Design a protein around this ligand. Structure first.
Ligand SMILES: [Cu+2]
Ligand code: NA
Length: 370
């Protein structure tokens, strides 16, 4: 109800399936400007989810957006067909893959039991925010784009009698994500290991961490394959009963999707808030929900109880972004002098400092008893 009026919150139900598939789904959030011009700064970007059931195959297609795939759950093989090169990669949880726009891909989940789930960021190259799929594979369902060509053109192009080529493009009726056999799975992923492979930071030391949570990020400073989009991929885990201390991002807007657990968030927004007033922008986040955190906006997340709270965040305008913590042992006030603190709060500087030093921990701490 009220949460339908928080323009930064995109509940999971707002993701729209692009097709009706038996063995998975592909669902995409509307353009970010659908309900608010406050998100015009990220209009070119879309987020989506791909889900493959066990023993499933997503048919060959390309998109007209530059993408970043992040594996959230399971294992799957991506096969990429370019004009002059083939690549296949066996992806696992935490893998990040930059996929060039126009790359023809297919996906395979070889596992017998576990779903394969990918969170995707795409950026348009045609009309702003418009990202479309082009099924080369297919027939009647999904419709293959080859059916847009006249039969004489297909005959001449394929050097194949028109009735035979037209028949080829009518056989598939099962949809875009279908069953795959054990032998097909073997064959397709047999060679899997411009288009570089995935990277994975799961085993690295976090950038920021404590006993209550972890943050690590793939930045374009480090990963050249993210530089063109100027994107980052952030992984944040808040342990059960924890919170991330209030912080803000200096320049990067974040598109945060919940992968595990639940949290309460509170954000300070001057836009929705004449002299400045900060609107209290609040809600709850569940698995599959998205929150957009505009740059500069103070935010906190508080894990709510029975689970860790885990998110993947895409960062837009990521180069040169820095996290600025607003409480904790390591925070911005560490770099503000005592006299400036005294003037800031109209109280003795040593007293301000005493209060600001009470929190001995950094980054993530125990949340409120609630
Ligand atoms: Cu704002
Ligand atoms: Na489905």
């Amino acid at each position: 109800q009220q949460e339908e009026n928080v323009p930064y919150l995109f509940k999971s139900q707002r993701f729209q399936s692009r097709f009706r598939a038996s063995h998975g789904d592909f669902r995409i959030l509307p353009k970010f400007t659908q309900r608010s011009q406050l998100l015009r700064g990220i209009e070119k970007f879309r987020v989506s989810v791909i889900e493959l059931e066990p023993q499933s195959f997503m048919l060959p297609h390309h998109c007209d957006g530059e993408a970043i795939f992040v594996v959230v759950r399971g294992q799957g093989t991506i096969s990429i067909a370019e004009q002059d090169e083939k690549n296949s990669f066996n992806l696992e949880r935490g893998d990040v893959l930059r996929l060039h726009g126009g790359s023809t891909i297919h996906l395979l989940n070889r596992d017998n039991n576990e779903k394969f789930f990918v969170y995707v960021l795409a950026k348009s190259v045609n009309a702003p925010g418009q990202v479309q799929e082009y099924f080369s594979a297919g027939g009647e369902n999904p419709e293959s784009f080859y059916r847009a060509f006249s039969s004489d053109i297909l005959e001449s192009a394929f050097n194949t009698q028109r009735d035979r080529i037209e028949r080829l493009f009518r056989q598939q009726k099962q949809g875009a994500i279908i069953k795959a056999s054990e032998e097909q799975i073997r064959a397709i992923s047999e060679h899997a290991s411009r288009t570089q492979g995935p990277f994975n930071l799961m085993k690295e030391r976090p950038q920021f961490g404590s006993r209550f949570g972890q943050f690590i990020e793939a930045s374009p400073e480090r990963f050249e394959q993210l530089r063109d989009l100027d994107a980052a991929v952030a992984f944040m885990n808040i342990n059960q009963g924890g919170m991330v201390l209030p912080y803000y991002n200096s320049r990067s807007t974040r598109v945060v999707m919940v992968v595990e657990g639940n949290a309460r968030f509170e954000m300070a927004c001057p836009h929705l808030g004449g002299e400045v007033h900060y609107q209290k922008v609040r809600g709850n986040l569940n698995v599959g929900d998205v929150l957009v955190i505009p740059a500069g906006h103070p935010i906190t997340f508080i894990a709510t109880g029975g689970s860790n709270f885990r998110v993947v965040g895409f960062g837009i305008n990521a180069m040169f972004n820095r996290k600025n913590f607003l409480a904790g042992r390591e925070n911005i006030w560490r770099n503000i002098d005592r006299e400036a603190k005294e003037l800031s709060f109209n109280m003795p500087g040593r007293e301000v400092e005493e209060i600001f030093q009470k929190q001995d921990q950094s980054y993530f701490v125990a949340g409120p008893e609630h």
